[PDB]
Design a protein around this ligand. Structure first.
Ligand SMILES: Nc1ncnc2c1ncn2[C@@H]1O[C@H](COP(=O)(O)OP(=O)(O)OP(O)(O)=S)[C@@H](O)[C@H]1O
Ligand SMILES: Nc1ncnc2c1ncn2[C@@H]1O[C@H](COP(=O)(O)OP(=O)(O)OP(O)(O)=S)[C@@H](O)[C@H]1O
Ligand SMILES: [Mg+2]
Ligand SMILES: [Mg+2]
Lengths: 60, 400, 433, 85
């Protein structure tokens, strides 16, 4: 039983449409445990259409 | 995730010149000795290697360390070696060395000398860290166990063994630690500020896109936390109820439940912020009443153990690691047997999985007997004092 | 002298409709029960009766008192009667009543009702006091035991039973309470102010005197009535002047007298206590870790426009090493040493009535230490029995300890505290064969 | 069977005081510490001085001049005796 498992479960219904949901989840866990402060935002800065988001998920 | 072996030198009653090693059996390690043998000392060492935390009341004056005065030293060094196995099954070793120095006027200084964590693989060993702060975080990560519950639940000090029965303020502090509540609150506050940060700075599709994502992410964290807390609480409470029913002799109390109370803050910008107040409650017949200030000594010990077991099962990754230091404290004839039987049941149920490590420390004959033969344990450890009054570790085969 | 009988109503696990009574035997009373039976509660009632102090952590929500909700009433009342007799040997009764009321709210409010201390002599009962504050002082004086030590050692709560092992700060407060150190400092300061006031008055009257001296000699030369008046003034002033000088010498010595007596009292007690601890630790503690245990006490003096400051520590010695026990002692070692220290404290400190109550002395003790502790207690029973100066109370659930204690000593009875059909605590006397 | 109050008396017997009765002085400090009342000791001193000064005023002139300490010495011993009664 997990805490980000529920985070991911939340994004089952509605995809967060222009970031890949799965990389985000590890990112927030990395962000809170690996505690790099910029990365999640930077990850999004690099992130720069439904198809492209799908590709983002596959690559991860 | 297994712990394999622990070697102790120069701590407490243990000598600084010849080290003592204990090998941890699966699924039960029994350590028995007379008063002051050095049994509790072992868990402290187990606690230190994994957490980097010294026992409460032993932080300064080199209380932890075998006293310099007995041996004619100005310096004593204590080293703790723990060889353990990862969740993945990679083999690791963690060692901690500490220096105690004696100056003139009888004053003493205690210092952490060095910490090293190496990996045992193939024929080669690789060092991951010599930094102590890294050590604590990594070992918690490597074992698959959060650092907070290692301190609170897995390796609870005999002195702190009753914490689930402390006053509401302290009890709340301990639970918040276990739930990592503060860190989750900080990360959510962090993302919203970042969202607003970018909003101010404000290709168009990317922006509308980011706002949809950010609302979703913050909502998920907020929702996942609540759901996590509610879920964890309920399974824990069910484990507690079951154990107390199976174990607690006597008809005065039907069951025991942890009650959690919320203060809720409502925001459109910040989502929801939750504050938890915890209390342990009895139930007799239809009545529920708060235990604190209202329970017996035997009830206190028993309820505390049960809360610890439930917490470990639900919170910790399903590796059966817990250490119990004199569980039989203040328990009557019937309750001692019952605990042993409950423990034996827990071992049989959870053995099939294959990874359970249970450590029981005792000086009590009846309790020792119920566990001793029936369990698959082929060996146990006795702790005696030698003539130099140093503690030695002896392994006894029950066969002979 | 002796405590005779205790009646409990509506306290803790005890029902609110029928009282449960215990008759305290001499010189050993044994109370046995399963976990949560209501044994320790008996000791709590004994402390409440004599001290008017409720158990720790039972101060709010009426934790001490039987829950109102359990019995289908809105209010419950608790009454505790203790029949005891003084050193002189007349018998007193102290009654304490507390009511717990449930509010039409989440909260519950607790209030202390009237308490009476009455005296039974001849065929009648006479009220000595109906006022509570008067009660606490009266019970301590009639028993011959100080209130603090009654609280600290005679009826020490199972939850607080390890206090001699506490951090240095807490240990210091408990000892300061036992020794009345603070009250003594207060009295010394009072004397000093009185001395200084008289010193100032002394100066004024002295100078008034020699002025009046000049007038009396002036008058001798002239010679009528006016002369006579001057002579009288001189006499009155010279007398007061000498009276004050005498007062300053007296106050200063009395100042010194108390300070000296205190320091001498404290030192001699410690020594006496320390010797008993040693005798007991040697007799009792199996294991070679420690030969004896001693309390070490240190004094510091502070300067003010006079104060003795005391710090206490409990120490280990094996093979000449002096080791502080704090942070360095085992669980079983803590239990045994605390028991020994309380026993010593009472013997030396308390007026010599063999009153102590031990609640589950066997906590965290191995078989040998259990056997040993029982044997020491039994030894103490045999020596002190003939005189008729001992009442020892043991609360236990341990069969081994039970056996070594019970049969040989003059107890034809012991008390079992079990729960009735309705789950209320009952006190039953089991007759030994 | 020793106590502070008993120890203050022995000290006084070692170094005797001249105008203050010693039994009531020890009772007064006991009352202040036991009966918790703060002005018992001051009330005692003030009384003892007033009694002393009254007797001294009554005394004849020839007696007064020669010695005064001897008379306060007498009255304090009388006070001790009165306390014993
Ligand atoms: N800093 C220290 N230096 C020297 N000896 C110490 C020190 N700390 C503890 N000891 C000794 O080591 C013992 C404490 O070891 P423990 O692990 O508490 O023994 P134990 O097996 O737990 O005994 P129990 O809990 O009563 S069954 C005591 O007997 C002390 O004499
Ligand atoms: N306010 C209360 N109202 C009703 N019952 C209470 C209340 N407070 C406590 N109790 C119960 O009364 C009992 C009190 O037992 P105690 O005398 O303190 O323990 P005990 O008999 O010493 O058991 P041990 O020490 O473990 S052998 C417990 O079973 C409590 O559940
Ligand atoms: Mg221990
Ligand atoms: Mg009890």
């Amino acid at each position: 039983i997990s805490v980000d498992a529920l985070v991911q479960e939340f994004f089952a219904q509605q995809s967060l449409k222009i970031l890949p949901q799965a990389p985000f989840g590890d990112a927030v866990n990395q962000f809170v445990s690996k505690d790099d402060k910029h990365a999640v935002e930077m990850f999004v800065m690099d992130s720069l259409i439904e198809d492209f988001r799908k590709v983002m998920e596959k690559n991860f | 995730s297994k712990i394999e072996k622990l070697s102790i030198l120069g701590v407490r009653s243990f000598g600084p010149h010849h080290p003592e090693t204990i090998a941890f059996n699966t699924p039960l390690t029994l350590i028995v000795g007379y008063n002051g043998s050095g049994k509790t000392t072992v868990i402290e060492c187990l606690k230190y290697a994994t957490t980097g935390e010294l026992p409460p009341n032993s932080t300064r004056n080199g209380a932890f360390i075998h006293d310099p005065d007995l041996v004619g030293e100005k310096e004593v060094r204590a080293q703790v070696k723990l060889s353990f196995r990862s969740t993945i099954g990679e083999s690791y070793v963690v060692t901690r060395n500490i220096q105690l120095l004696v100056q003139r006027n009888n004053k003493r200084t205690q210092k952490t000398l060095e910490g090293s964590l190496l990996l045992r693989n193939n024929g080669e060993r690789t060092v991951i860290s010599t930094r102590v702060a890294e050590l604590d975080k990594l070992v918690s990560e490597k074992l698959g166990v959060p650092p907070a519950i290692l301190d609170a639940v897995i390796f609870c000090h005999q002195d702190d063994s009753l914490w689930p029965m402390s006053e509401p303020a302290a009890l709340k502090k301990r639970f918040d630690e276990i739930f990592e509540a503060q860190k989750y609150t900080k990360v959510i506050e962090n993302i919203r500020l970042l969202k607003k940060k970018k909003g101010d700075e404000l290709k168009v599709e990317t922006t509308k896109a980011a706002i949809e994502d950010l609302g979703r992410g913050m909502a998920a964290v907020d929702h996942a936390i609540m759901q996590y807390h509610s879920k964890m609480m309920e399974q824990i409470n069910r484990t507690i109820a079951e154990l107390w029913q199976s174990t607690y002799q006597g008809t005065d109390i039907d069951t025991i439940q942890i009650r959690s109370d919320v203060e809720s803050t409502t925001s459109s910008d910040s989502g929801t912020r939750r504050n938890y107040n915890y209390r342990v409650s009895m139930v007799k017949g239809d009545t529920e009443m708060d235990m604190r200030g209202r329970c017996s000594a035997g009830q206190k010990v028993l309820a505390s153990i049960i809360i610890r077991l439930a917490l470990a099962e639900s919170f910790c990754a399903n590796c059966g690691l817990i250490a119990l230091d004199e569980p039989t404290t203040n328990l009557d004839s019937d309750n001692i047997r019952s605990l042993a039987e409950s423990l034996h049941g827990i071992i049989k149920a959870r053995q099939a999985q294959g990874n359970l490590q249970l450590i029981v420390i005792t000086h009590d004959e009846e309790f020792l007997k119920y566990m001793q033969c029936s369990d698959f344990c082929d060996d146990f450890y006795r702790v005696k004092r030698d003539e130099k009054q140093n503690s030695v570790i002896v392994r006894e085969s029950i066969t002979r």
